[PDB]
């Protein structure tokens, strides 16, 4: 009632305060999901998150707050597969338990992207990845797992076929196994690049001039580059690797720094 009025007011106020398009999108989505649900508990959650976004001035914390509220509202609105609820719960538990902001943002972003897809194949891969992260006490390994899960989930929401997600699942499992055995962060970032290249149905060449590997990626539509960049840049930040990304016409070059 009064919460419904305030939710719509706050979402508009948040859109005036912050110029970043993602906050504006998440604020609008929170209002929409809060209305689509008839749960008071979802309404108090959306209200609390939007209000904190207005009280705070740090865009980064506000982004994370809205990501949590939209995730929870998306899986609590109506009746969703049990796997979506379990994905959201385990991501929210990983975020609440960690002090590293990279784990909070990796968990929320991987879980919200999975919550947007309807493929049961994609949900079980993301859930199995979050189960492994929860079993570990190694925050370094958790960041590797979340980087893989977010890359995979982005392929799913970018429309990758079930067949390409089955191949991407194999790389998710390969990356986690390699990280558990002590593979370098550079090796793990290369695996994310390979995942995105195969998942988007394009091609790559790998060149190792000296100490630093260079991947040349061909065949991406320009508006598909953003998906690969988000997956690779995010994975590189999560695993502590610098990458240099250069663009030509249809060609993307990524240097993995060592």
């Amino acid at each position: 009632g009064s919460l419904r009025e305030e939710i719509r007011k706050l979402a508009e106020q948040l859109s005036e305060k912050y110029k970043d398009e993602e906050i504006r999108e998440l604020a609008r989505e929170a209002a929409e999901l809060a209305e689509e649900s008839d749960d008071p508990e979802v309404l108090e959650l959306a209200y609390e998150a939007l209000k904190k976004g207005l009280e705070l001035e740090d865009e980064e914390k506000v982004k994370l707050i809205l990501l949590a509220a939209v995730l929870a509202a998306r899986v609590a609105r109506g009746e969703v597969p049990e796997e979506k609820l379990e994905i959201a719960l385990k991501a929210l538990e990983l975020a609440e338990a960690s002090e590293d902001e990279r784990i909070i943002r990796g968990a929320l972003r991987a879980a919200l992207a999975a919550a947007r897809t309807d493929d049961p194949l994609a949900l079980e891969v993301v859930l199995e990845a979050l189960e492994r992260a929860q079993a570990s006490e190694d925050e370094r390994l958790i960041r590797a797992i979340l980087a893989a899960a977010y890359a995979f989930a982005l392929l799913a929401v970018a429309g990758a076929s079930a067949e390409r997600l089955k191949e991407a699942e194999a790389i998710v499992k390969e990356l986690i196994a390699a990280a558990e055995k002590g593979a370098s962060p550079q090796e793990l970032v290369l695996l994310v690049i390979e995942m995105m290249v195969k998942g988007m149905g394009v091609t790559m060449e790998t060149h190792r001039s000296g100490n630093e590997v260079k991947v040349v990626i061909k065949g991406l539509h320009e508006s598909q580059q953003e998906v690969l960049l988000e997956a690779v840049l995010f994975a590189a930040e999560l695993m502590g690797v610098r990458v240099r990304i250069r663009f030509k016409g249809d060609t993307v070059t990524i240097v993995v720094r060592e």
Binding site: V42, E44, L64, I65, A68, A72, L85, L89, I104
Partner: peptide
């Protein structure tokens, strides 16, 4: 499902308070 949804909402509220 109802029990999981309540736990998701409860954990999300705790996280938002922590982030704030």
């Amino acid at each position: 499902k109802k029990e999981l949804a309540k736990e998701v909402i409860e954990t999300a509220k705790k996280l938002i308070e922590k982030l704030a």
